[PDB]
Design a protein around this ligand. Structure first.
Ligand SMILES: Cc1ncc(C[n+]2csc(CCOP(=O)(O)OP(=O)(O)O)c2C)c(N)n1
Ligand SMILES: Cc1ncc(C[n+]2csc(CCOP(=O)(O)OP(=O)(O)O)c2C)c(N)n1
Ligand SMILES: [Mg+2]
Ligand SMILES: [Mg+2]
Lengths: 340, 324, 40, 343, 324
């Protein structure tokens, strides 16, 4: 006798095939799964992805010049980041990781505040009211357990919104990634869990993280569904997050979505441009317009960041508690005198 | 009503559930079971499974659940089954909830109270009785509360739950049903950051918290027979410390000792001693000494009585100070 | 209400000197060690 | 456009059906999967299970009388605890949870040391050399990541051996449960992970832990084999652990085994079905049962006396076991307590 | 040879790998990559993937791995990428490895050395720079070591590795490559729990550790221009304290300050003050004062220069003590 272990592995693999709608040539390889989007929605998605590419180029530049601080590059991930944000509504709450600044910009965080985050200023994290996002999460996996609680809180108040959160391929090794999806699954909470898989965590291959042949199957441990998507495909990424959003509002619980991407022919811009051009929906001048719009907006935002007054120690003390403890009262005074 | 500490806690918790529709209570086995020590007994029956609920067995998850819920308007009161299990929950409490107000420039906040039993003298299994207040007391943006009597326990908990920033409310197991005390019915509050004199004296200040307050009062009584009048300050809150009350007393008496159940290298006694040295050395007749457990891992259950500090160590140390 | 560092209060006590009696020459009235000697 | 979500959950769960060889009546309902055990091995497994039942009854009783401290009952889990151990070799290293005392007793921990553990005495945790176990682990889930490291240790030394560890249905909710299996998978380490599911964690049903239909399927997150077994069935438990061991020692990585159990339905008892299976084979009798029973009671009574005769712990003892060489603070405190003891 | 601190650490790690076949180095990105800070640069290439290897992204798992490896007779030297990430792995360091010798009554032991970078002054992102030595110093069965120089780093690390109980070796980021110093080639050890005088003085004792040592040496040179002679004590090991060296210094000078980068409610300064109060209060001309960060979360990067304690804070508090 032998347990059918190899069969088991094969059987589970068959449940997680890569979802794709557009190939690298911008041709539709899956009509049945094509999402319903107006010609203007299709053009907006391309505007935002082109905008994001330029934002990445400018941010890299600005960091090298010393004009920005911490910056995690996003070029190549536009479909995964932008097309996934596109499937959301304003009611939806985003819990970003450190690299997921674009999603929260498009959700309504002003650009200059995103730059003040990068530089390390408290004001960059002073999110506007009505904008349902947290500052980027530097502790890997912490956003996953927090998203379970947001989702639960959404379900409790009866709201028709989801919590959505993002992590990388490396983050799937954390204990909190597992707890996030298992708490949400246990509570049938409305959460979308995105894992952006670019195959390396710093220097570490995904093969060193896990012997699991897809990350999406990690959903099985929670009892919830997973989808592995071509993360270089804006339509496949859109359709997956939209299906997960529907599933979640319909009280069916969370979904785990693994996007397979590459950060810098497979370029999401490449295949989407061809998709749109075949339909007379995109032109060089429309694209060159977004590029200019971006550069102008980035320049303005950088200046608005530059005119933000410096932080004082008293400011830092003031934001610790609503009512300050004796020690921080004492220290406010010491630093107020210092600052005078 | 004459109450035990666990009853005063349960009463605090009913009064806040009734007063505040946003108050939630959750943790392992806090719902239908009514809590491993009955502290949430009757609460789910009265208030519903949607206000008082069980979670999966995962402390880190519980911490993150409380954060999410608090981002969504609720005023979470989770429970960590024993405080020895805080190790797995440290990021969410210290790395996250303590930091959200600061981190968001006041845009979000964390009106969370974490309830956790701890403490020795009842032969519990490993990592059940560990005194870990010293760790949380080192984290900016948390307050840390340790009641010693049913009366304190109830007022401090209502305050703690009303507080719009994170509070760690630590409940000593030995003290849960060790003594009965008249605690008011209805609502009242005690301010967080305020100690009180439990026995007035003039020869030596004894500063204490948790189970060590009783050990200190019991020592004060044996010291009176020897003509040593010891004043007993129960810290109540160990972060922030009530500097005025502590300093006033040492200024009055000119001699002090600090008493804790935790190992000498742990707890908050060195903080207290440093504060006194800094603010009242001109009043000091003698070094401020510390009563504390030996610097070992918490004792195998049978060794508890020889290992834990008690009234006799307090007496011996106070006398060491008197004879300096 | 007297103010005096521990080493002084102790220097006083062991030498039978009541500090409350001794006039202090140190800052803000502080009773210094050579004041205990001056009283003695 | 629906994604086939409903189908996915079903098809995956379908990969984890309950493995069973003995039904409640002692009838072989799966003869192909039948493990090769001699007549004497079958008796020995039964002797061990009977003895462990007695140990539970006597331990509950002694605990009530205050002659034991911490005690986590085991009755009903004899197949899961004892049959799984039976599949092991002495080279294998056991990382038990708080409830997994019988496994370490059968691996070679003297019974009086098991009792000293229960009372709270350091000598109870003084594992005899060559008995490859750790004392029972109080922190639910900690044993899982430690086992991944033990197994990697074994692999690096090229030892034909495994690490095995046990947790409950509740403990599958911990981060470290997941990290242990995922690390063992990533390093292809000789680890066997056992999950003992009796449907309750104190007062919390499995259904409040996870919406996963099996706990065995959690293996999928690590990309390692998972097996769900009737944990009231000594032969299924043995067969699954033996198969996990052989895969491991032959260098193919870890396995997760979920056992379905129930703690004290009287029909389900692992003793009931195993007695019938062995009696219908003429390998078990009432005499043999009562010889085991009386032997257990004698040995337990001797163990409890030996525990009673262990010298009481002193603080100086607790200090000296902290480090090989004492740091200054502990040198100081050792002298203080030496004087206190002196007396 | 003239080495930076990172080179002396690499040199210590190289020496231990050659000397002891049981030594193993592992962590996030320490193998092929040679480390986020090149601390393990060249080590895998010289010694193999079986001695120096990478791990999945999980702090908790690394600790557990180190424990199991130690049970199998290896001498693990794991790395945690930044110490702000310790919250994840508190159970295994504090709840497990520090307790195993005691828990097993000496049957098993944990010859483990945890290397972790920490510290500010380089504008790192969130939870990279926090000083969390105060947390691990409260755990019985740990020893905690923090070098400030190339020469100390090598001798202390060799000592840390050969120690048969767990040692946390905290490596300040600002000090990795900040200056060079003559460091003997080959092996030497420095005792754990042993301070040294980095500058002899007669008027005030300045007790420091980590990056605050250089700040105290800088303050001391400024004070000497005004005829104030400071004795700079580098603690080197923050647990346990070198009581003999600290008290001896304070008895000589009669005045003392304790300097740390950590927030005032954190770090280990209160312990040092308390120890002084206890053993040498009769030598004190003035109270023992502390230089420490404000009690806020570690600052947003741009705010580091105004928030972090520096040599000017040391100069100011030293004078406060001189003029007491
Ligand atoms: C808990 C924790 N451990 C380690 C780090 C350091 N770190 C920052 S980015 C990174 C790589 C993460 O890789 P991945 O999850 O794949 O996301 P990616 O950066 O590729 O987008 C690591 C280990 C951290 N921020 N948090
Ligand atoms: C990390 C941790 N959390 C909580 C506890 C307290 N506790 C002890 S047993 C228990 C129930 C565990 O149930 P399960 O995992 O299913 O195993 P079982 O006891 O049923 O065999 C809990 C919550 C603990 N010891 N450790
Ligand atoms: Mg990656
Ligand atoms: Mg169970």
């Amino acid at each position: 006798f032998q347990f059918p272990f190899a069969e088991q592995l094969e059987k589970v693999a068959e449940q997680f095939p890569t979802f794709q709608i557009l190939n690298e040539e911008g041709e539709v390889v899956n009509e049945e799964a094509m999402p319903e989007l107006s010609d203007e929605q299709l053009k907006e998605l391309m505007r935002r992805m082109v905008y994001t590419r330029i934002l990445d180029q400018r941010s890299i530049s600005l960091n090298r010049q010393g004009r920005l601080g911490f910056y995690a590059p996003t070029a190549g991930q536009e479909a995964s980041q932008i097309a996934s944000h596109f499937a959301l509504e304003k009611e939806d709450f985003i819990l970003p990781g450190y690299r997921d600044v674009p999603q929260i910009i498009w959700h309504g965080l002003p650009l200059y505040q995103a730059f003040l985050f990068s530089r390390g200023h408290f004001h960059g994290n002073q999110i506007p009211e009505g904008v349902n996002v947290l500052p980027p999460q530097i502790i890997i996996g912490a956003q996953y357990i927090q998203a379970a609680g947001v989702a639960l809180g959404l379900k409790m108040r009866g709201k028709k919104a989801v919590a959505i959160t993002y992590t990388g391929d490396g983050g799937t090794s954390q204990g909190n990634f597992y707890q996030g999806i298992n708490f949400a699954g246990a509570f049938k909470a409305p959460a979308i869990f995105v894992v952006q898989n670019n195959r390396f965590a710093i220097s570490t291959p995904v093969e060193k993280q896990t012997v699991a042949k897809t990350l999406a199957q990690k959903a099985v441990a929670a009892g919830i569904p997973g989808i592995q998507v071509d993360g270089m495909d804006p339509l496949a990424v859109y359709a997956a997050v939209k299906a997960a959003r529907e599933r979640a509002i319909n009280g069916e619980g969370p979904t785990l979505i693994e996007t397979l991407c590459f950060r810098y022919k497979k370029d999401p811009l490449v295949r989407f441009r061809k998709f749109l051009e075949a339909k007379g929906l995109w032109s060089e001048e429309e694209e060159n317009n977004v590029i200019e719009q971006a550069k102008e907006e980035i320049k303005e935002a950088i200046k608005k960041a530059d005119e933000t007054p410096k932080q004082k120690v008293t400011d830092l003390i003031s934001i610790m508690f609503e009512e300050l403890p004796f020690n921080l009262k004492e220290q406010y005074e010491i630093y107020k005198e210092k600052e005078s | 009503a004459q109450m035990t500490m666990v009853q005063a806690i349960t009463d605090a918790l009913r009064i806040e559930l009734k007063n505040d529709p946003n108050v939630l209570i959750f943790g392992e086995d806090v719902g239908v079971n009514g809590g491993v020590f009955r502290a949430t007994e009757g609460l789910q029956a009265e208030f519903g499974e949607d206000r008082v609920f069980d979670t999966p067995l995962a402390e880190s998850g519980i911490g993150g659940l409380a954060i999410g819920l608090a981002l969504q308007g609720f005023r979470p009161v989770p429970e960590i089954q024993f405080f020895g299990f805080v190790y797995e929950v440290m990021d969410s409490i210290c790395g996250q909830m303590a930091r959200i107000r600061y981190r968001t420039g006041g845009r979000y906040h964390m009106p969370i109270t974490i309830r956790s039993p701890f403490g020795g003298g009842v032969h519990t299994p490993e990592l059940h009785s560990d005194s870990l207040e010293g760790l949380v007391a080192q984290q900016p943006g948390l307050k840390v509360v340790i009641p010693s009597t049913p009366y304190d326990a109830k007022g401090l908990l209502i305050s703690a739950i009303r507080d719009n920033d994170p509070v760690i409310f630590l409940e000593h197991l030995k003290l849960y049903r060790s003594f009965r005390q008249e605690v008011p019915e209805g609502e009242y509050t005690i301010p967080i950051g305020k100690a009180d004199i439990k026995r007035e004296g003039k020869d030596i200040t004894i500063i204490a918290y948790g189970a060590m307050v009783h050990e200190s009062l019991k020592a004060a009584a044996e010291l009176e027979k020897e003509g040593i009048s010891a004043e007993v300050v129960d810290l109540r809150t160990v972060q922030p410390l009530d500097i005025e009350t502590i300093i006033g007393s040492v200024e009055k008496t000119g001699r002090a000792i600090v008493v804790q159940e935790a190992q000498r290298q742990a707890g908050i006694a060195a903080n207290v001693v440093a504060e006194i040295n800094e603010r009242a050395i001109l009043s000091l007749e003698a070094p401020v000494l510390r009563v504390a457990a030996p610097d070992t891992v918490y004792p195998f259950a049978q060794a508890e009585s020889v290992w834990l500090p008690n009234f006799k160590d307090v007496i011996e140390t106070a006398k060491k100070v008197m004879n300096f | 209400r007297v103010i005096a560092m521990p080493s002084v209060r102790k220097y006083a006590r062991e030498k039978g000197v009541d500090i409350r009696l001794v006039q202090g020459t140190g800052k803000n009235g502080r009773v210094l060690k050579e004041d205990i000697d001056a009283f003695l």
